[PDB]
């Protein structure tokens, strides 16, 4: 009484005030009212706790009873926690499109979502079209892209190409997007991005019986197992339609199938903090999966 809070979207900074009784749902609904977003089911709020870990805020719980890092103001990020199976069909509002575009671009540039060079150049090209508008020889003389972060670091290292040569390659594509509007340019970026192997998947350190280190992938379509040094190639898949239950205890996850005449799939995950997030992402991704097939 009263508690200053800052919530940041991808392109805005919001300043609110909360009371000791304010619930996660209340702060969340205020952000949504302020921003005018209706596709609320993809999003959540992130905070840093007193131990330093990034945590998703629980909505049906008081903000002051979640061990948010004590500072003036309290810091929050409004981000997408879930991703649609198809951007074209599910991202209706332009605000939803913009917020997704910006979050995905950031993850591609931070090398969190892998993207090969040619595709990265083409993606940068749409970002340039979205920011700059139509190519214009009079305004966009060589060097105009020098103060833009356009490519993932992974790309800038592997090649012999200079920064300026990369900017020429991106310019060349930008010229070809002539009459493309901002909204369409962001959607074209998203359509290409969503087909990337690492797009929309949450990766977690995992183990089998033998103790072999693997990756677990949680996404819109189901669960996937990856070998430790290849996050691009699913080795085993668990579609949501084939899953009855997911639970964990201490360090063991049990996935029960629909079939009932089929064996349980079990794996091991080290940290409780992480396992809670794994469980929550499964439930959410499973619920949204069903909704799309039962309107």
């Amino acid at each position: 009484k009263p508690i200053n809070v800052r919530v940041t979207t991808m392109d805005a900074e919001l300043e609110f005030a909360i009371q000791p009784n304010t619930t996660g749902k209340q702060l969340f609904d205020q952000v949504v009212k302020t921003v005018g977003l209706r596709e609320v089911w993809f999003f959540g709020l992130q905070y840093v706790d007193s131990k330093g870990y990034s945590t998703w805020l629980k909505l049906n719980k008081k903000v002051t009873q979640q061990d948010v890092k004590k500072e003036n103001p309290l810091q929050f990020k409004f981000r997408a926690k879930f991703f649609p199976e198809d951007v074209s069909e599910e991202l209706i509002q332009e605000i939803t499109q913009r917020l997704f575009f910006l979050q995905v671009k950031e993850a591609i540039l931070n090398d969190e979502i892998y993207c090969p060079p040619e595709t990265a150049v083409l993606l940068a090209s749409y970002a340039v079209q979205a920011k700059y508008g139509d190519y214009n020889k009079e305004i966009h003389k060589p060097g105009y892209l020098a103060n833009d972060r356009l490519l993932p670091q992974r790309v800038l290292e592997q090649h012999k190409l200079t920064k300026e040569q990369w900017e020429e390659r991106i310019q060349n594509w930008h010229e070809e997007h002539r009459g493309m509007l901002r909204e369409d340019s962001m959607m074209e970026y998203l359509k290409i991005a969503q087909d990337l192997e690492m797009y929309g998947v949450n990766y977690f350190e995992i183990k089998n019986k033998k103790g072999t280190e693997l990756w677990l992938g949680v996404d819109a379509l189901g669960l996937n197992i990856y070998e430790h040094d290849d996050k691009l190639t699913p080795k085993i898949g668990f579609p949501w339609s084939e899953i009855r239950n997911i639970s964990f205890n201490d360090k063991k996850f049990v996935i029960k199938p629909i079939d009932k005449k089929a064996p349980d799939f079990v794996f091991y995950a080290p940290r409780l903090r992480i396992n809670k997030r794994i469980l929550a992402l499964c439930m959410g991704n499973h619920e949204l999966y069903m909704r799309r097939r039962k309107p």
Binding site: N208, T212, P234, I236, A262, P263, F265
Partner: peptide
């Protein structure tokens, strides 16, 4: 086809997982 996991039943999933 998109980059999806190879098709198999749950017993085959467990066998493949268990010696990766």
């Amino acid at each position: 086809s998109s980059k999806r996991a190879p098709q198999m039943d749950w017993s085959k999933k467990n066998e493949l997982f268990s010696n990766l």
